[PDB]
């Protein structure tokens, strides 16, 4: 019971254009259910809440005082945030809050902080300083000044929770688009795989260099010009090195991580970005079922072993290589 033209709703949340599309005859009401679940989770987890009413806003408030009871969503997301900090090359840390709050890249008051300000917040970054109580469902930051930032895994977790709300309503065929996070469920009604736009990391969001046939997967796109600060004609993107305080700078311009779960595409993005085109390709080769497309600063495109010869390059300004 598939339609060719889907039920579709677009909003604009978290400063990003969100679109949900369901190709299932009769399942129109599931659009408002998906969006309700996005707005409910986004309100629980955000650290950009100017009112400071979030569950994370409260943990950050009681840093070095007392633990904070949290809902299951927040407790689960933080638990996964800590695990992704273990796997990394010391590259990923949900306690990067104080550094990300200082730069505040992509906000109206985005600035390049002085070296002295950056040196002040670095020693406060340690995921091992986050103690969770299971029997209490409390999260505690052990030292004053620590802050949580879940921005790196927030959209991935939300996309997976949107996908689960979808299948509880027996949706079979859908597209979830949360800016740089895309989930394609089932197939194009016409029977072919979904054609996923692989973002041009040198153009506004939606400009693509090529399509990638996928079905039942997440594509999480990162780029050096997605949300960036330009001070004195020098660019600073949002993926920061917790051990230096500055953005990661290598040959990578864009990466799209193809995974089963969108939270994993978000979760491995930082460590993958941190290691460079070739060091990051090898990092992806250690994850079964995870693959990636890298786009170098010289506009050369690289596939991981599981995606070789599958990506269809359609911008002639870009070339394929090994
Ligand atoms: N090294 C990091 N570890 C954890 N979270 C980070 C890190 N760098 C940036 N973030 C947060 O995650 C966002 C970038 O995630 P993404 O666009 O998925 O690469 C930033 O806006 C910060 O809120
Ligand atoms: Mg991320």
Automatic annotation (TrEMBL):
Mg(2+) 1 binds at residues 152, 266. PROSITE patterns: PROKAR_LIPOPROTEIN. This is FAD:protein FMN transferase. FAD binds at residues 14, 91, 93, 149, 155, 222, 227, 240. ADP binds at residues 91, 93, 149, 155, 238, 240. AMP binds at residues 91, 93, 149, 227, 240. It catalyses: L-threonyl-[protein] + FAD = FMN-L-threonyl-[protein] + AMP + H(+).
């Amino acid at each position: 019971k598939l339609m060719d033209q889907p039920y579709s709703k677009t909003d604009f949340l978290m400063g990003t254009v969100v679109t949900l599309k369901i190709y299932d005859k009769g399942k129109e009401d599931v659009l408002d259910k998906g969006f309700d679940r996005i707005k409910d989770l986004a309100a629980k987890i955000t650290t950009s809440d100017s009112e400071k009413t979030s569950e994370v806003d409260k943990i950050n408030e009681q840093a070095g005082k007392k633990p904070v009871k949290v809902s299951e969503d927040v407790y689960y997301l933080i638990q996964e945030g800590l695990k992704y900090s273990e796997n990394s090359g010391g590259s990923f840390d949900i306690t990067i809050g104080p550094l990300t709050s200082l730069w505040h890249i992509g906000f109206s008051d985005a600035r390049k902080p002085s070296q002295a300000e950056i040196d002040a917040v670095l020693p406060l970054i340690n995921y091992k300083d986050v103690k969770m109580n299971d029997k209490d469902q409390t999260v505690y930051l052990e030292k004053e000044g620590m802050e949580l930032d879940l921005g790196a895994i927030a959209k991935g977790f939300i996309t997976d929770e949107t996908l689960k709300v979808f299948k509880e309503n027996k949706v079979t065929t859908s597209i979830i688009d949360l800016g740089g996070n895309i989930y394609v469920q089932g197939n194009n009604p016409n029977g072919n795989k979904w054609n996923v736009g692989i973002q041009d990391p040198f153009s506004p969001r939606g400009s693509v260099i090529g399509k990638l046939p996928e079905s039942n997967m997440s594509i999480v796109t990162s780029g050096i010009y997605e949300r960036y600060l330009e001070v004195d004609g020098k660019t600073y993107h949002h993926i920061l090195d917790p051990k230096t305080g500055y953005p990661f700078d290598n040959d990578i311009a864009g990466v799209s991580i193809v995974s089963k779960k969108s939270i994993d595409g978000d979760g491995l993005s930082t460590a993958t970005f941190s290691k460079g085109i070739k060091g990051g390709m090898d990092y992806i080769e250690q994850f079964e079922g995870v693959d990636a497309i890298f786009i170098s600063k010289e506009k050369k495109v690289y596939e991981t072993s599981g995606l070789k010869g599958q990506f269809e390059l359609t911008d002639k300004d870009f070339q394929m290589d090994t």
